[PDB]
Design an enzyme around this catalytic site. Structure first.
Site, PDB file in Angstrom:
ATOM      1  N   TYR A  28       0.817  -1.215   0.000  1.00 58.77           N
ATOM      2  CA  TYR A  28       0.000   0.000   0.000  1.00 58.77           C
ATOM      3  C   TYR A  28       0.863   1.282   0.000  1.00 58.77           C
ATOM      4  O   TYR A  28       0.328   2.374  -0.147  1.00 58.77           O
ATOM      5  CB  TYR A  28      -1.042  -0.085   1.137  1.00 58.77           C
ATOM      6  N   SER A  29       2.193   1.183   0.159  1.00 56.54           N
ATOM      7  CA  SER A  29       3.013   2.371   0.356  1.00 56.54           C
ATOM      8  C   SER A  29       4.498   2.093   0.133  1.00 56.54           C
ATOM      9  O   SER A  29       4.952   0.963   0.095  1.00 56.54           O
ATOM     10  CB  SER A  29       2.809   2.948   1.728  1.00 56.54           C
ATOM     11  OG  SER A  29       3.595   2.253   2.674  1.00 56.54           O
ATOM     12  N   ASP A  42      -3.867  -6.797  11.625  1.00 52.03           N
ATOM     13  CA  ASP A  42      -2.678  -7.130  10.849  1.00 52.03           C
ATOM     14  C   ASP A  42      -1.470  -7.252  11.782  1.00 52.03           C
ATOM     15  O   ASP A  42      -0.342  -6.924  11.395  1.00 52.03           O
ATOM     16  CB  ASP A  42      -2.464  -6.148   9.684  1.00 52.03           C
ATOM     17  CG  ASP A  42      -1.534  -6.640   8.572  1.00 52.03           C
ATOM     18  OD1 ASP A  42      -1.556  -7.854   8.231  1.00 52.03           O
ATOM     19  OD2 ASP A  42      -0.806  -5.806   8.016  1.00 52.03           O
TER      20      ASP A  42
END
Ligand SMILES: O=S(=O)(c1ccc2nc(Cl)sc2c1)N1CCC2(CC1)CC(NCc1ccc(-c3ccccc3)c(Cl)c1)C2
EC number: 2.7.11.1
Length: 329
Positions: A48-49, A154
């Site tokens: 995601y990054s 997570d």
């Protein structure tokens, strides 16, 4: 249909707060100036990054920048909200600013800077006392976030950061976290396979904070036994087989019974029949110095199919495994 479930702890905590606290869809983002930070070097690529070390030229303070890849604005607002809510909490990463490139329109999260000790160095030196201490530190962060109506979803070693030189720990990567609301059905396509709870694998969506406690056991196992990953499933189905080959099929079928869960016709083939194994069989000379009666008691009480019978973070922190670390305090 499936039997409903509510959290045994911190159930109505978000209900007793203002809607803005958890109605992240309504959050307006306070933008900072991107020209306050210059990027120094890349630290990681991550789904995601991307993560960079940067300097704030305002005060010459070192910082961390996560430039985001395209996600939906509501998921960003979610993460930002959760971070802001948890800021100041024990061992929670500190969001410091939020900036957007005025050209690419890409948004970027700016964090405090924590040095990670090299994995190899740390892993090879760990010690039982160290594991106890850092697990206590993770539990601290989890009981805080749970009390604040938030589940990480997570928990895993990637999202824990240790600066052993300064005996300092942070829980990061809050982009999958969600607010617990009693009666709500969540997405089960969250967390990585090796750390997924049974409830995600059988598609029971009325889950809660206890999801984090499963993962935490998944973490503890790999450390005390020195096997990463501990449940090494080939796919989402085989992940439950890996779990059942240890915990046994009996408690599993008892769990799907209690919650009148319907197993995909598939599992009913592969699961088979499996006795509940004893932990001794994952012990060898190279890990014995980490394994202890206290530890296996602790692990057993986290790794349960039934989310409702797992230890809460605060009960976990009260477990005999951590009696020595709490006396240092
Ligand atoms: O460079 S990054 O991408 C980065 C850098 C800065 C940064 N700042 C923000 Cl804000 S996000 C961000 C991302 N990167 C750094 C390295 C990691 C992955 C991310 C974290 C490391 N954790 C492994 C680990 C975790 C727990 C234990 C443990 C030890 C004892 C008892 C239990 C567990 C052990 Cl032995 C090992 C792997």
């Amino acid at each position: 249909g499936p039997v409903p479930s509510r959290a045994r702890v911190y159930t109505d905590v978000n209900t007793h707060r203002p809607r803005e606290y958890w109605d992240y869809e309504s959050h307006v983002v306070e933008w900072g100036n991107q020209d306050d930070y210059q990027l120094v070097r890349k630290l990681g690529r991550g789904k995601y990054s991307e993560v960079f070390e940067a300097i704030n030229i305002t005060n010459n303070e070192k910082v961390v920048v996560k430039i985001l890849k395209p996600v939906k604005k509501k998921k960003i607002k979610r993460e930002i909200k959760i971070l802001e809510n948890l800021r100041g909490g024990p061992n929670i990463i500190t969001l410091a600013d939020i900036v957007k490139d005025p050209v690419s329109r890409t948004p970027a999260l700016v964090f405090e800077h924590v040095n990670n000790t090299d994995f190899k160095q740390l892993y090879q030196t760990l010690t039982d006392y160290d594991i106890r201490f850092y697990m206590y530190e993770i539990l601290k962060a989890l009981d805080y976030c749970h009390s604040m109506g938030i589940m990480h979803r997570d928990v895993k070693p990637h999202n824990v950061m240790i600066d052993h030189e300064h005996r300092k720990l942070r829980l990061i990567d809050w982009g999958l976290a969600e607010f617990y609301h009693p009666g709500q059905e969540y997405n089960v396509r969250v967390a990585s396979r090796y750390f997924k709870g049974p409830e995600l694998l059988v598609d029971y969506q009325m889950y809660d904070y206890s999801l984090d406690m499963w993962s935490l056991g998944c973490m503890l196992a790999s450390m005390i036994f020195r096997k990463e990953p501990f449940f090494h499933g080939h796919d989402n189905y085989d992940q439950l087989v890996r779990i059942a080959k240890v915990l046994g099929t009996e408690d599993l079928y008892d769990y799907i019974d209690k919650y009148n869960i319907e197993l995909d016709p598939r599992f009913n083939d592969i699961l088979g029949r499996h006795s509940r194994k004893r932990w001794e069989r994952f012990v060898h000379s190279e890990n014995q110095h980490l394994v202890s009666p206290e530890a296996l008691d602790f692990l057993d009480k986290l790794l349960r199919y039934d989310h409702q019978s797992r230890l809460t973070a605060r009960e976990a922190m009260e477990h005999p495994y951590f009696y020595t670390v709490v006396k240092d305090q």
